[PDB]
Write a protein that binds this ligand. Structure first.
Ligand SMILES: N[C@@H](CCC(=O)N[C@@H](CS)C(=O)NCC(=O)O)C(=O)O
Lengths: 228, 214
């Protein structure tokens, strides 16, 4: 079985996706905080680890690295690729986070929700983009609020078809894993979550989960005291 | 009613991802071009058992990465798997990471919607987009330094290549220098040799304006 080390940041939504998945699946992992406010993502040493200068970075070891056989480890620098790797590399794990492969329709619904969040909301509202907006003399908060609002609109329309207790029927999936940290992020920029009633119900359902609380941005080792 | 109908646009990179996949996997689809001036691409999937909405025999997929993986899973015996086998989760992960750099970190911040928002701030959407594409291609190039053979990962075409090609076409529009990414350029050029990629070429669609056919 593989060993896992996560380069993460308490307030990184993409990091939180992995934090949630690890706890849900009962997979132990080693924590390596990277301070994004201090620009530790920008150091040459971290660019060597992840060439996008982003967190999370998942470093997997005790495995056969089929891409670089001489390497003791394998690095996964994008959260959705890392989430699917947990699913594929640990097929006997007691808590699959996708519908079974015999249900490609449900799997596509789950992935569509993940992609709206990970493609259309997070990347255009992250720190790097907010800084580019500020450098143009725009308001990064309004920019981000408008884009998150629009993206949550798309998520809500999907949940109108798929949601039961959770995003897609009555079991937690990768959709819920992506939803929770995106809601934490959207709240930082003053998005009105009540405009999205199903999304809000499902988010609140997830907050009851011990796995989600263990994963909370306010409960990490690198959460500053003032934010705990 | 067609099994697959693609609401697409000749110059949409995300549409281009799906065109390349359908041609490479030889999956027939009905083309539904959509004018510039509403999700594009939107893949409408019909004649199915809808396990999410059972009173319906169809659904749509408005995100290209989800649509790509759906084609893999809905047609498991297709002659051209675009992921490495499930027995090789490392290679699958490396493929998906390259796809995600492009689909998460490049395309969405350099698309029409965001270029318009940049212009609305009196910014230069070309410089903005070239800057972001250059940064993401830097990351793609670093991954290909580890994995590339003939193609992005090893010597077989995968979803990494399918995402790579339309991203190169989009990046060229904003003046990105592809020569700065030499393995990326090499794999891009290898893909252009493919009949399936040519059939999928942004310059060779039914809705390509005549002045952009060459
Ligand atoms: N698509 C990437 C996005 C990674 C990303 O943008 N991470 C953010 C934190 S959520 C980051 O490290 N930001 C650094 C910066 O913007 O300077 C993924 O899914 O991992």
């Amino acid at each position: 079985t593989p060993n896992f080390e996560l380069y993460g940041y308490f307030r990184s939504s993409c990091s939180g996706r992995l934090r949630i998945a690890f706890h849900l699946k009962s997979i132990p992992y080693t924590r390596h905080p990277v301070n994004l406010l201090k620009g530790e993502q920008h150091s040459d040493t971290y660019k060597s680890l992840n060439p996008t200068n982003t967190v999370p970075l998942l470093v997997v070891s005790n495995i056969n690295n089929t891409v670089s056989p001489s390497s003791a480890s394998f690095s996964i620098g994008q959260s959705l690729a890392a989430l699917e790797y947990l699913e594929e590399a640990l097929p006997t794990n007691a808590r699959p986070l996708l519908p079974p492969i015999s249900n490609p329709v449900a799997r596509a619904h789950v992935r569509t929700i993940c992609n709206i969040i990970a493609c259309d909301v997070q990347p255009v509202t992250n720190l790097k983009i907010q800084k580019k907006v500020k450098a143009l003399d725009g308001d990064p908060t309004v920019w981000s609020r408008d884009l998150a609002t629009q993206g949550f609109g798309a998520v809500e329309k999907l949940l109108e078809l798929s949601a039961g207790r959770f995003c897609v029927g009555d079991e937690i999936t990768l959709a819920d894993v992506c939803l929770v940290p995106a809601v934490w992020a959207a709240e930082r920029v003053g998005m009105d979550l009540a405009r999205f009633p199903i999304t809000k119900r499902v988010f609140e359902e997830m907050l009851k989960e011990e796995a989600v609380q263990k994963a909370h941005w306010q409960k990490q080792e690198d959460t500053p005291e003032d934010l705990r």
